[PDB]
Amino acid sequence: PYHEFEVSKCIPERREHAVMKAAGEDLTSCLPKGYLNTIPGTISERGCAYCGAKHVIGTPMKDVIHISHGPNGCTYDTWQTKRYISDNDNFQLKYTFATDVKEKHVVFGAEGLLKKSMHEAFDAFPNIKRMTVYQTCTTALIGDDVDAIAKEVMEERGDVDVFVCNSPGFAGPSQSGGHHKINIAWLNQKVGTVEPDYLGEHVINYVGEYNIQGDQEVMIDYFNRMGIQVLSTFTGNGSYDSLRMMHRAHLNVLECARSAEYICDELRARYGIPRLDIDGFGFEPLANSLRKVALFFGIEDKAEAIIAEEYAKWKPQLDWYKERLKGKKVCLWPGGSKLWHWAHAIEEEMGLKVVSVYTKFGHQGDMEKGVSRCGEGALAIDDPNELESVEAIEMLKPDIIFTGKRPGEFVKKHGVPYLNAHAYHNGPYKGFEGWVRFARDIYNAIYSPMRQLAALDISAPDAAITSGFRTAKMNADLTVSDEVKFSEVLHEYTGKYDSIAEIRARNQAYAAEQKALRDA
Amino acid sequence: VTQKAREGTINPIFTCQPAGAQFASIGIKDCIGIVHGGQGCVMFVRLLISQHMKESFEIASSSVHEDGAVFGALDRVETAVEVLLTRYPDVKVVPIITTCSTEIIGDDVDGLLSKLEDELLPTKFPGREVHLLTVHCPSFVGSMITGYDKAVHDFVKKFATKDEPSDKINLITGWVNPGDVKELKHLLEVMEVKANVLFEVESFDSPLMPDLEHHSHGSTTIEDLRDTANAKGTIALNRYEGMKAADYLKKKFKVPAVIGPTPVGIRNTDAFLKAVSEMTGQPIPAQLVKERGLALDAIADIGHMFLADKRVAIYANPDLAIGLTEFCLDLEMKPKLLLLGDDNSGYVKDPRVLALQENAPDLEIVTNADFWDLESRIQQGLELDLILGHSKGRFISIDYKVPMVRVGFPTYDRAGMYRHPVLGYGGAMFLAETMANTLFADMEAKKNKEWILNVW
Amino acid sequence: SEKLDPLVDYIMKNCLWQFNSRGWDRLKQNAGILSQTCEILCGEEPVHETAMDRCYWVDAVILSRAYKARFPWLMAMTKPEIKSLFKALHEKIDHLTVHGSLNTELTVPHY
Amino acid sequence: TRKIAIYGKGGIGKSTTTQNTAAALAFFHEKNVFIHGCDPKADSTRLILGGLPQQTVMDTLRIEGAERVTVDKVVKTGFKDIRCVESGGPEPGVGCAGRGVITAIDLMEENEAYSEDLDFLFFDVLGDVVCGGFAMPIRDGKAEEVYIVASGEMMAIYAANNICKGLAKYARQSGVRLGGIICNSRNVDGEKEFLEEFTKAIGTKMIHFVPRDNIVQKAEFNKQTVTEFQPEANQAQEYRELGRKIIENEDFVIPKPLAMDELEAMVVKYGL
Amino acid sequence: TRKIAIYGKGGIGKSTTTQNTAAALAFFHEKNVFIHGCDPKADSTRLILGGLPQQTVMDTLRIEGAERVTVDKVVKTGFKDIRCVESGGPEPGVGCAGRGVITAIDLMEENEAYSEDLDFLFFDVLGDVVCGGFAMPIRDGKAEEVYIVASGEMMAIYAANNICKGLAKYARQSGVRLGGIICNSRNVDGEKEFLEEFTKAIGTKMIHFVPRDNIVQKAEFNKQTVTEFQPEANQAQEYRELGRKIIENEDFVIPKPLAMDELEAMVVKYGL
Ligand SMILES: Nc1ncnc2c1ncn2[C@@H]1O[C@H](COP(=O)(O)OP(=O)(O)O)[C@@H](O)[C@H]1O
Ligand SMILES: Nc1ncnc2c1ncn2[C@@H]1O[C@H](COP(=O)(O)OP(=O)(O)O)[C@@H](O)[C@H]1O
Ligand code: CLF
Ligand code: SF4
Ligand SMILES: [Mg+2]
Ligand SMILES: [Mg+2]
């Protein structure tokens, strides 16, 4: 049934944006609305279409000048807020570009300023030959023709390539407008314009991955070990030119269907490339995904070998945390796909109880996925506002919340710990090792001795003041049995602080080897 | 003075005007602003304040979409005010901050205020004290500094009301940290001077309490703002962050205004205290001589041994950056580059900048700067020992191996920098010792005469 | 009834192939994957005439493995009742994902 | 000072009527008149200055900056010492004239361009009010009265009704009122009866009827108003009467725009 | 298909001439014509649809969303199966009508509204091209030819000259060309001579002369064109000749705008 919040009675439109799973209901009984306009003044969590296009999908590309046509403020506001890394020395994190539109450019036109800014950026970074121009609110209203300027700059330089993304912040209800716009733009302008140099025997496009803390590198490692060529990645750790070659892959391996399903559906409709939805998170979802990809190419035995090896290495460590986390309650509050990527896997493989999910921008498809994969009684919210979140916490009493940084700092002031669902904490959270890293983060947040200390009132007359120390393991062992506590097979996470250094230093070795053989 | 020759931006130093108006608004008790425009315009600013403070602050949006831009979006603001007021019954001040989009299309938010006060407030919130104001912040003008300056002017102009005279002064702090306000309030309390402090941002640091939840908020009240008209005088520390409000008070209510100096370092703190002493009649007491002496003893331990002849690049909010340059010169350091990151035309007329040009010989001042100014000068051969700046220039520091002291806004890559002063004598001691310790850690990382840190 | 609820429940808790973006694509996804699963469980070798048929088959292979592992009563039934059951399963998944769906985006004509 | 904004269909004669009425006001009624042109093509002050000004508020902001705009570089003086300024703006197809008008009127208020001794301040606005920046002349602290120029052509009346719709909105925010409809004749059959019916239907009046005369074009080719060209001509007397009727106007209303089915029904008797 | 944009001074008869020529093209020459009104007041297809359309592209995005705009909800069919769409836009004094035209034309492109078997696609634009969004019809992939409607009045010629100045940019960027100047007579003394001389000084031709006739008013009051109203009237034959001249046009040039001193010297012969 549709859940109406006490804080949202005055805005009755909010009633049909929340459901509570009930026994005897299916997807055709009730379903929260989605991808609608925001109610003004609600202090919702939603962003703008420029965010969805530029900040989320565009910037991950590693060999590109990302210049926003607009004032400095849009460019500053999205700079150094994301954790998509690259093997291009993180160029996409360290350099950001604006045309710096002033009032004279608003009144008289900013196209000359855009052309001059593009030439300046190419001049300052002569090793970069690719560029994307993003519209902002300002330059989208006044009608600047960015496409004509991009054509002029390309012909004046003769060795650069420019992509145009016309996604101003107001052009849509949330980041989702940006997802759609940039997908269709890249497909229509850029796909098919470059031919691959080498095409191996099993070629995939890895679609919908943005390399948060090295998530893509983790997945590339697995594909290398199955002998699968990743032609391009959309767009984490992705290069401009490889993404122009997407029309030549045997299979589209889609991870985030909220942000990249558009290009996948259109590549399927145009070039006949099949679309295979996968999970990167969890042990069993990731194992099944690897099995499907290897099965498509007839190389199943390679996937099974990876899976057995990874299970033997990481399953004992994951089960150490799973034993200590059984029954703990969590609120799953990302923006998009991570709510249905995690809801079932976290309950099964860490023992947590998912009491609520929400999406900031997701459509009704994300909610039908999320409601399906959640248990009965879970609260599913679309376009949540701050007061609704407070009410949900007071009703559900979660032990941890997975949400954003600023929402996390809010719920901290209501007693609850948080893990960053967006940027991770000690990521990457993808892979088999990554799931163990996620479990350790959950366990550290929940069983912190500092959390119990903060709950203690020292001015209370008979206050339970103690001395010495406690550890998280002391706190968590109070919840397990003797058989679990003295198990000789379960042990804590044995991994480096930077798990990606060794993974990246392996993907690069593989690349070198493959090049050697090919060039011979 | 060098004006940046490029027209585009590579790595901006500041954000836009609406962000500054939003930051000024969160310093007022029972105030939630509505940013009129796209949702990104408010969500990113809340994230940016969160990066600096590691706290969450309530700011609302009118959520302008495509139909709002094409058809007009004043109905969005009317809906936003109603929704915000019904759902937050403790709110008394609602500033309506415009953005680039609604400044371009010409949404008449001033006229809407009149209608709201005549129709919506008396009808659906009868007897409730609600004050609405507009802050016009076109992001293609100025920067977050000018947005902050304008918002302080707008808040004062809304509320200041002539009444019985008060012995208080007005202290407009400028854009400062909670640690800075604590230091300034300590100075005033030793001098025995009551002030209307704009703004009281110590409560930005909220405690993690056992039972009673307690969120971050500002502590400047409507009564503080109302009483600004009755003060003996106004001291605005920052000429670019509060001189407009002070000029308004002088012109409208004849409240004498003293602009600056920013009390960065020993000498400028003395000048600030002398201004307070002249305004109020209160003598500088012997306790301040002692606290000043303590800061000077710390500085003497490190000054001509470690700080003399160190080459420094500085960027911050303009007033803080200029004051930091002056303090570094007093410490015998060699400031090489000063970055003033926006297009304000008052910098070249600023008496502090004219004095820097006269007597700081190897210092280059770049107005309308971005971070590519600093980085491309290092690539061309500028050698620095130290950088003073905020966190968005951290990759220059990381990649070129120049240590940086985190000052200004935002400093998100170090823990708890908002709790330490850079103003006053306490701030001078904190600043000088942090510079020394940053340099010490760098010598040890590079093994650069690191054996010398034994009998200094 | 007692045979459909475990099968439908496993699909909706574990699988992602039934949640395509548009109803006309969901119909093809449902038909291809479920028919091939019925063939696998009946001892047949499905024949592929397209790359999408092969993509249907990988989902079908994984799903049939899970059904064999978790529902032993399938390997005891004979082909007529397996066909009827998978005909019923196909109808139920179609109703849940397309016919009775409250997801109104499935009728958006563009991707 | 009576601050007035002129609206109406494009090319209906707003600029010509404003300049000619201003000349008649200055010459026949000895009034201090100011004209602020709010059209980017900056053609609202040619008949008074005897040629297009070459300094616009926006051209000056583009070259020197907003802070270096002065009430001496952009405000000019023409016939009978009528003070004129042009907002300026971009050439067609680029930028944002709406923002330019917002900024230009803001700057002229900041620099006290409108002197206390003015009897009339005319904001001459373009015909396509496409944005909120072209309604800046009817915000609080700006024009308190609006005159709409129309004619017997059904599109001109439709444009007048459309302008009244937008003017009803601001009437509930700002206290701007409609002073009447000025009819610049286009020689339409039933033009007078159509205009009388339409003004009554929306709650206003036809303040004056301005005939269609070729002497207006002749004076315009000679860079002047009819009052400057030929003070004793009949068209000059019409502008003088129109100026007199504006001076003595006291009927300022919130218009009631007609639904399109009402206007469609009204125009049936005129196509016969 | 020949994609054309119509520009000119405000209220000079862009919409009337566009609709009447479209009706003549469809009726006398059996042509497939499409009209895209690029004016927020949405009056560019009333004569073809026989009444103001009640679904613009912008009204449909506001009600349904961008993703639900369909080439069946917003495209209507009128006289001689002429297909008509209106961009729509805000009421006067609010919003951005330039952005609405950008979005409306974008949406008609994404939904492939303009068929490939069309013979003519007219973009009927407003008279105040105040921003870049009103130049959207002459971007790449849009109108390839521009006809400016003018008249012998000096402000119409000045407006036509201004449009030529702004049109230089799009002639360079998208290759759009000026096909000629349509002269809608305003009964100005020496009108034909002034138009010939002006069209010669900028490098183009007066493609046709449209007489000022009141049958156009009568037909407009009757919600139809002259061709629908009275096919055998003289004015209908004038639109039939203009349509034929547009069909058989091969003179497409980049106009060379006149500095205003040249235009000032030119208008002296006509102020006598
Ligand atoms: N009463 C009139 N008789 C004859 N021509 C007129 C009359 N009023 C205006 N005109 C003509 O109208 C043309 C366009 O008018 P203009 O003032 O430029 O329009 P707007 O300012 O409304 O765009 C001018 O060239 C002028 O000669
Ligand atoms: N050839 C003509 N003869 C008579 N009246 C005309 C003629 N062309 C246009 N008109 C009149 O011009 C009025 C306004 O023209 P319109 O086409 O609406 O202008 P625009 O589209 O340029 O804004 C119409 O209402 C019509 O009565
Ligand atoms: S310069 Fe500043 S932050 Fe930029 S928009 Fe303008 S006021 Fe705002 Fe806003 S919604 Fe997104 S983030 Fe921008 S494209 Fe618009
Ligand atoms: S319609 Fe008005 S606000 Fe919008 S771009 Fe054009 S001039 Fe500017
Ligand atoms: Mg005019
Ligand atoms: Mg028209």
Residue numbers in the entry:
A (entry chain A): 2 to 521
B (entry chain C): 5 to 460
C (entry chain B): 5 to 115
D (entry chain E), E (entry chain D): 2 to 273
The authors write:
Nitrogenases catalyze a key step in the global nitrogen cycle by reducing molecular nitrogen (dinitrogen, N2) to ammonia (NH3). Some diazotrophs encode ‘back-up’ or alternative nitrogenase genes: vnfHDGK for the vanadium (V) nitrogenase or anfHDGK for the iron (Fe) nitrogenase, expressed upon the depletion of Mo. Upon complex formation, low-potential electrons are transferred from the [Fe4S4] cluster of the reductase component via an [Fe8S7] relay (P-cluster) to the active site cofactor of the catalytic component. The active site cofactor is expected to follow the general composition of [MFe7S9C-(R)-homocitrate], where M is Mo, V or Fe, depending on the nitrogenase isoform.
Using anaerobic single-particle cryogenic electron microscopy (cryo-EM), we solved the structure of the adenosine diphosphate-aluminum fluoride (ADP·AlF3)-stabilized Fe nitrogenase complex consisting of two reductase components and one catalytic component at a resolution of 2.35 Å. Following anaerobic sample preparation including plunge freezing inside an anaerobic tent, we obtained a 2.35-Å resolution map visualizing the expected heterodecameric complex of two AnfH2 dimers bound to Anf(DGK)2. Indeed, our structure contains one ATP mimic MgADP·AlF3 per AnfH subunit, locking the Fe nitrogenase complex in the transition state. In the dimeric interface of the reductase component, we observed an [Fe4S4] cluster coordinated by Cys97 and Cys132 of the two interacting AnfH subunits. In our structure, the [Fe4S4] cluster is 17.7 Å apart from the P-cluster. The P-cluster is in the dithionite-reduced PN state forming a symmetric molecule, connected by a shared sulfide ion and bound by six cysteine residues of either the D or K subunit. During catalysis, the P-cluster donates electrons to the FeFeco at a distance of 19.4 Å. As previously proposed, the FeFeco is an [Fe8S9C-(R)-homocitrate] cluster that, in contrast to the Mo and V nitrogenases, contains no transition metal other than iron (based on ICP-OES). Intriguingly, the G subunit contributes directly to the binding of AnfH2 through hydrogen bonding between His114AnfG and Asn112AnfH as well as Thr111AnfG and Arg69AnfH. Indeed, B factors around the αIII domain are the highest within the catalytic core of the Fe nitrogenase, hinting at an inherently flexible character of the αIII domain that is stabilized by the interaction with AnfG.
